[PDB]
Amino acid sequence: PSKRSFIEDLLFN
Amino acid sequence: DIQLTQSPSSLSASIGDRVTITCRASQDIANKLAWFQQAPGKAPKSLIYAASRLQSGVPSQFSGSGSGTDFTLTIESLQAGDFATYFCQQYDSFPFTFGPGTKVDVKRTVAAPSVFIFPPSDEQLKSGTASVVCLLNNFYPREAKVQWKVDNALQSGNSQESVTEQDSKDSTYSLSSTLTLSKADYEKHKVYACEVTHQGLSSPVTKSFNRGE
Amino acid sequence: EVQLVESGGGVVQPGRSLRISCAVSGFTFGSYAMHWVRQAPGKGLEWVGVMSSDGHNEYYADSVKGRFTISRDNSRNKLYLEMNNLRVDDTAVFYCARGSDYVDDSPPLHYWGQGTLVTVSSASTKGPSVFPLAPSSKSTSGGTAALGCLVKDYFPEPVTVSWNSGALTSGVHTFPAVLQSSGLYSLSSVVTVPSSSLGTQTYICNVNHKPSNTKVDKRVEPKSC
Ligand SMILES: [Cl-]
């Protein structure tokens, strides 16, 4: 289940 | 949050024109700027992302430019499917936000509306209500002003209007406005008039009738 | 092929809560952040919010203020939006859209569903009254007369209008309905015809309101004024 939404994940960190 | 402003809010163009639409962000958003196209009743379509990257399946007369706060969508040679509404959208930071949209419609020569008025029907009057309808037929450009006057008193809050989509064959618009009163109020007054202002009219046009005529 | 399909829209009373859903195909749902966007009738696109691919994180438009909640189920691969304390101006089409993909350089909001319409109303299903818009000297220009029908006080949308059972299409304008303060819709349909035809030709508007099974065929008679 690899995380593909890098843009959103970066903003959530 | 980040406000996106677009300019112009609407414009008219012809097939083969070069069209430019701008988007301005209230904060620096680097290149994290997208452009969308939307046709009536359809989901929007992603055209551009990362300010200048054309999306797969999108014709390449579309191109985007800009970085930071000022962005431009250019349509190099306008084609029939490109008459639509365009939105910019930033994904630099949460919350994501959209611009208000820019509508591109088809340019044609100014055409004044033909103005018509319809009294209420006896059937509706028997039910206790009077609706009066004003029709502005086949005009261009879309901007038009309807004013309702009842014995020369301007009416507020008791009328509604809507406008058709631009006609595919003659590129005009039409508009319908309904003034609605109770039957008791309708019978207090004599003259019912619709007054129309439009670029194709050198002076506003009034259509009217007398109740009971 | 990427596909997203929203479900669950419809008419709902103000104050209630409504859960809409989004089902997907053509990609691994659990890999993506997921977004909702809304569009009120005649208005612009408005971002609602996002939930991270694992469900741990969410972010909302400034205006939501806790009133809408996004959830997801990475076993059935469904996205949800729960809208609470609904009010009349919540009426809007809601779109689900996929988050970004760094591998394919796909931005957030590349792929969208078709939308589902949420209509917030206290009104009850009612078929329209159909009133003539009679041709008269007040609706003539040159040698053409305008006439029509006023399709009034129905709920919910839509109605359809034809003229003379579809035989008459040239010069017809059927307008978008307006929502009256009563919560019922009102719509007009007009047609321009030769003034010389009014004495011999019958003009009938055929009105269909399928939510109420109303079918009305209203003959539009001329006036002498
Ligand atoms: Cl927004």
Side-chain angles (χ1 to χ4, degrees), chain A residues 3-9 12, chain C residues 31 33 35 54 99-102 104:
Chain A
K3 296 167 174 274
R4 296 280 272 277
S5 299
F6 180 73
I7 286 162
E8 293 93 326
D9 287 333
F12 280 129
Chain C
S31 298
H35 303 246
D54 55 9
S100 65
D101 191 321
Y102 79 103
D104 305 327

Side-chain angles (χ1 to χ4, degrees), chain B residues 96-99, chain C residues 45-47:
Chain B
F96 290 175
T97 51
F98 287 91
Chain C
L45 304 173
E46 291 187 333
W47 191 76

